[model samples]
Target: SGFRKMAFPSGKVEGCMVQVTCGTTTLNGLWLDDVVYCPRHVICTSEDMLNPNYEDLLIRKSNHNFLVQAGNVQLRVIGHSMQNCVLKLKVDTANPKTPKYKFVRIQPGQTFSVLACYNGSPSGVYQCAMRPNFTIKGSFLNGSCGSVGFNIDYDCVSFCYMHHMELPTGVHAGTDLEGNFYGPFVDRQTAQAAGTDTTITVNVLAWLYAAVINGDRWFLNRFTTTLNDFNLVAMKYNYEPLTQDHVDILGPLSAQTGIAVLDMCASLKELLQNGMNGRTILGSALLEDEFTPFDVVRQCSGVTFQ
Candidate 1:
């Protein structure tokens, strides 16, 4: 028993409209006059013809997922590809201790999906548009595409805004709050943009400080989540490009944090504003916990202060 949907069973025929079968009433009609299928549904559409219901907002890599980094608690998707999928994320702050996660949009409706990282525990299942229609249990770890980790107590330096075209090598191995190193490369392009020589070093420093000081991983989680969200929005909103201010934020922020500066491609302003929430210029990703492990080695170690 099919509910209500239009089906073009015979494939596309010239001047033929799909027939919508609802109950016993068969309504035969073509696509709405001034609409076309958006990129999201275009792959399924016949190349020769256009889909009348195409909406630009429905496509262009927006609203899928993102990533952000700050202090401890990195919120990233474990191992999942969420292309063409909708996620409902909610913050569960009710319980102060061991708060349970919940999805913000757990109800059945068209508006249950959010386009960015949610700064709290997420509850509910992520619904896949395809397959057997079975819902995955448990809260989403943001999106698998945005997972990250934090390291502790490393020295980081600052840099001016300039495109540094060099590879960033991790100084003393990068690690997450769980003591797991992201290893090799977190995001390649971002490291280069923040400053070629010392990008990864800065990143490791930020991770270390966040983990050791606040004992929280929210900073990394926020960065990864925000990055994914910003990218999604940039890809979706073609007319909206990343502003100079966005680039400025990314250069400095990348230099300071050590993540890939390229991850700021979407819009550094948007990422900072959305992820950090408070304080501009120097965002909250690192500043939240003002414990500088950077001074530890600089003062005590045999390394000379440059």
Candidate 2:
């Protein structure tokens, strides 16, 4: 019954995405259904994308569907490397002006790479498959170098499209990933040894969940924004939605813990990557007494949501 007018289950077959269970347990993320057709556009490469009110450019195509002529993009890498490195396009999309979208389900088959040059030098280009990873969350895909000792020139190759589906059911939870991948739990030993006993990794994740739901401004405002990155994972992992309670806890901690938060987010990014093992599965209760995200956020922040 949906999009029957078009070729459909028609439309250009851009790519496919797969849904997998998190951490040997079932996914608690909301169940969603639909099909969308979108062009593979180079992200943020269009003028309309840079306009201040680009949201106004959305043209309705059908029920629950709209067109995005320009895809919204942000360099999701953060910390000292973000400040030091410059990102330039590795390849040009011949037609960056074209529009791409739909809200059905999602990925590409043949793999592609998100590569970087060490310290902006084109000679030593390598992928970030290990430290400082590239990740996909919800509709957003991001990459980080994972180290601050040396800056790397970055290039983003996202299957980014310019369309919005304001889903009543929920966000697209399935993932068909490319670029780079990592394990969320691998870097814990270094942090665990360095931090005060109070700053266990789970507690940090709990604070991230609470801070985002409470609408931490330094986190993200009317403008675009990054553990802030973890906000997307927390929301979808727990089937939570955004709320603006005007509470702020992340800012104070971020002042001293920002770097570690960035590292933590690297791990969250990995959990969502394809073909990974030893994932934390942060939101579910299948594990016993392991301290889920809700346990700490709700009990401490007193913020409530769906």
Candidate 3:
């Protein structure tokens, strides 16, 4: 009698269940997208640990084998056989005798994920579990699964300002004592359509002077460097220029004269609404005529004629 291949291969078991634990509770299955805020060490397990369908979400086959995952500040249970699984998250450790754990449930076909740093918990350890009715002794995640920390706002500030300059109004790029980031002085499109390169040049110098006056060293360096590339002296800062300038204008100003104060009169209203009121006045005094981009370089280069 010849032998045929078995109905189920060695590891191909259909009745297998998967569970994940972060601390105490064992989750049958959960979504990974909703776990943000506070540090978490999560562990997931399944009889079929390498199942493609159960990689992130806990895939449960009705009353049969199931899958599981963990969460952060909050955990929501959903789907059929909902009552069979218990999800608990204790973020605070102040009152160890009576720690508070919130219980939540998810609606069918819906997902749950939230972030709330209101409480006193700087970090947390959590767990998940499915009822033992359908269990047949699966596996527990071994070793360790680490935590992640991040802040979206502070991390993307420079990127945001760079993006802001790409808009039609890039001539305005200065900061104030009020901790406000000023945008473009004039709409580049409006100025271009109106054939006002002189106006644009003035506004650009105003922002440049304001940046120099405020001692915004970063913006000033970024401004002069980008100008050396003609890639918008006041705009983008995240690229390498196709052409490089060896002129050494601002380089001399930086080493010798140190940003001469012609007329450093910058205010909130002057920057935002009137566009280039103070900037134009100061730029006109230096250029003494309709301004061009080269005049800015000449003025900042500390060159003098008797």
Candidate 4:
């Protein structure tokens, strides 16, 4: 047999069921498509499981063993004998908080349910695939069943669209999420943006300069470090480059979480991507353009600089 199925000396492979000779044996017990290889001829009978003989159903044979991906299944049993039954079943990846195994005896026209987390077997007895929050829903639906075997009805589903994680929008990603700077930096940046509230126009300095009070030294250090990378210069002198020592004395804060420092890092990142090299961003008044000089922190309050 192929598909990881066992080689049972001239046995008949019928869908999920295999009919073997009387000398045939198996790994512990018998079932269909189960990792274990139990010769079905002894444990199974004339009837089958899920017996409409339709749909993408398994081979309709009772007293046959089996395995399943996650889902709910229905089984029909007989009164006189435990002949037609799922001799062995191994469920693959189980759902959260479900039992490892379940034993059910469904009554005529009644429903039952089983949550499979584990099954009874030895090491490497069967092959397993995929995880699941599978629940077996059983019921004795068929009123006319025989002692020869049991009946099974099942349906496996994958409603994947419903499985997802809801992410918060406009979140900051300054440090490596796993690195040293996600939480508090975002918090600090958030408050800075909110505090600004359209009251001050942050044209000359990085919009983040407002957050740079002496109380938080690291914030200023990080800001100046970003500025150094930008190679921005002071305009009052003969274009003195804005060094770490110079940036230490200046700026402001806001709230909106990532808005402050995030804006700072991103704004500079945007300039870096364009043709602007470090000194080029320091616009010269001699050339009329949207870009501005670096020397003046023109804190324009109550008036927009047009």
Against the reference, the lDDT scores of all candidates come to 0.24, 0.24, 0.23, 0.23
After superposition, candidate 4 runs with Cα above 4 Å error: 1-203, 206-228, 232-240, 253-266, 275-299, 302-306
Model 3 lDDT tens row, 1-306: 111111111111101112334434232221222221111112223332333222233333331122232223223323322111122222222211211222222111111111111122112222111111111111212221111111112112000110001123322221111112222222121332112222222323333543454344332221222333243422242222222221232233333426421111122112322344344333232212122223333334434421
C-alpha lDDT of residue 129 in model 4: 11
* Candidate with better TM-score, 1 vs 3: 3
lDDT of 3: 0.23
lDDT at 122, model 2? 18
**Cα lDDT tens digits for candidate 4, 175-199:** 1111122122221212222111111
lDDT of 2 by residue, 230-280 (tens): 557546554222222211323334443343445435544444333134322
Candidate with top TM-score is: 3
Q: Which stretches of candidate 2 lie over 4 Å from their true place?
A: 1-204, 207-238, 242-247, 252-256, 260-266, 274-276, 279-306
Q: What does each candidate score in C-alpha RMSD? A: 24.4, 22.3, 25.1, 26.9
* Candidate 2: worst-modelled 10 consecutive residues by lDDT: 1-10
Ranking of predictions according to TM-score: 3, 2, 4, 1
